[PDB]
Amino acid sequence: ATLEKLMKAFESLKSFQ
Amino acid sequence: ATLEKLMKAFESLKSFQ
Amino acid sequence: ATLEKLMKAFESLKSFQ
Amino acid sequence: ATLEKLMKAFESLKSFQ
C-alpha cells in the first residue's frame, strides 16, 4: 500500500534526524 | 532547521509516490 | 490501526490548509 | 508559515496517539 510506504519513509527520516 | 528538512523529505517522498 | 488514523489526520490537515 | 502550522498539527496528533 502507498500509505504504508509513506509511513515507513517518514519513520526512517525521523530516525535519521 | 530540522523542521524544514523534514518537510522537504516529505515533499520528495510524495513526489516519488 | 494507528498508522491509518495518522494518515487520515494528515490528509484532513492538508485539505484544511 | 503554512509549513510551521502543518508541523504543529502533526506533533499534536502524535501526542494524542
UniProtKB/Swiss-Prot annotation, chains A, B, C, D:
Q: In which tissues is it expressed?
A: Expressed in the brain cortex (at protein level). Widely expressed with the highest level of expression in the brain (nerve fibers, varicosities, and nerve endings). In the brain, the regions where it can be mainly found are the cerebellar cortex, the neocortex, the striatum, and the hippocampal formation.
Please give the residue positions where the record annotates the modification N6-acetyllysine.
8
Chain positions covered by the region annotation Sufficient for interaction with TPR: 2-12
Q: Which disease is it linked to?
A: Huntington disease: A neurodegenerative disorder characterized by involuntary movements (chorea), general motor impairment, psychiatric disorders and dementia. Onset of the disease occurs usually in the third or fourth decade of life. Onset and clinical course depend on the degree of poly-Gln repeat expansion, longer expansions resulting in earlier onset and more severe clinical manifestations. Neuropathology of Huntington disease displays a distinctive pattern with loss of neurons, especially in the caudate and putamen.
Q: State the family it belongs to.
A: Belongs to the huntingtin family.
Q: What is known of its domains?
A: The N-terminal Gln-rich and Pro-rich domain has great conformational flexibility and is likely to exist in a fluctuating equilibrium of alpha-helical, random coil, and extended conformations.
What name appears for this protein in its UniProt entry? Huntingtin
Q: What is the lineage of its organism?
A: Eukaryota, Metazoa, Chordata, Craniata, Vertebrata
